Ligand binder design. Structure first.
Ligand SMILES: O=c1ccn([C@H]2C[C@H](O)[C@@H](COP(=O)(O)O)O2)c(=O)[nH]1
Ligand SMILES: O=c1ccn([C@H]2C[C@H](O)[C@@H](COP(=O)(O)O)O2)c(=O)[nH]1
Ligand SMILES: O=c1ccn([C@H]2C[C@H](O)[C@@H](COP(=O)(O)O)O2)c(=O)[nH]1
Lengths: 113, 113, 113
């Protein structure tokens, strides 16, 4: 876009996740293995939070696996969805909502950096 | 059931997850792709929390993949486990503990709803 | 090791995850299904936290799936990474960073234990 994370929207007031759509039309087959789908949405995240990319249930049930992804607080690049056709040929259309971004507290530890 | 989430139990005091068993006997093959397993347990969740469904390690190691699922705070339907046989035929018996529900803080943002 | 979790390091100040490497050389094929990779790193976790094991994006994109794993607060054994070659033969070398440990708040409920 570059579009910030503040332009994502959430389905309902109770929704845990911010919806992420692909900006591309993409056809995916099982033998293709993981593919990085474009979102046009960019990091970074609110202070003291990090992000988790997870699939939507309807999409997962339709045979498209989204691999859990961690977005770091200070990531400033494009948020991509890591996706794979499980059994069937899977077609993603431009603007389909394919994943969700969940925001979570970033816990501070003394681990060396 | 309908059974609320307050009837789930946790393995040990330190357990992060609430145990979820299937209420059905189900046989799963790899070529079947994702299947939604019944739990008889229903949303909604404590205030300002959302839920994450994840597999148990022993089950995952036995060849049954549970796909991460997001339960929204205000979801009032039945919590299903999205499961797939990875390589082998997998048999689930009634009342086997197949997944776990982890509760997490729901972070409020200004994103449009 | 036995090495505590306090010896893990994080890539950048903003990194959500603590890096986990395999201590073994391991070759993984798709027909092998899930394998538990050794880390030499042991629980337990900071008070009132639990742990989530997730893959790294580059590794996932290279065809190695890490299955999400839950580390309980009071787990005192070795943290293993549950991994599977998706399509291709995957080779893991000693000390490759293959996964990440994310720490999360442990929410207290009244569920029976
Ligand atoms: O599903 C994902 C996973 C990661 N990333 C970006 C954000 C992360 O901050 C960065 C580095 O990822 P890791 O290799 O640390 O997981 O890659 C994504 O866009 N999507
Ligand atoms: O593994 C899952 C994922 C989702 N849901 C229910 C709860 C969610 O609030 C609802 C909508 O899911 P999403 O499509 O937003 O992920 O479906 C489940 O029961 N199990
Ligand atoms: O990916 C994983 C998942 C689990 N465990 C260990 C830590 C958990 O506390 C313990 C029991 O796991 P569950 O069966 O409750 O998920 O196994 C791991 O080392 N790695």
């Amino acid at each position: 876009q570059k579009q910030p994370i503040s332009k994502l929207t959430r389905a309902t007031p109770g929704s845990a996740g911010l919806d992420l759509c692909s900006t591309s039309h993409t056809v995916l087959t099982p033998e293709m293995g993981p593919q990085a789908l474009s979102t046009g949405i960019y990091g970074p995240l609110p202070p003291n939070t990090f992000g988790l990319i997870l699939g939507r249930s309807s999409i997962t049930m339709k045979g498209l696996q989204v691999y859990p992804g961690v977005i770091d607080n200070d990531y400033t690049g494009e948020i991509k969805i890591m996706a794979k056709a499980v059994n069937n040929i899977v077609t993603v259309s431009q603007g389909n909502r394919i994943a969700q971004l969940i925001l979570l507290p970033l816990i501070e530890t003394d681990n060396k950096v």
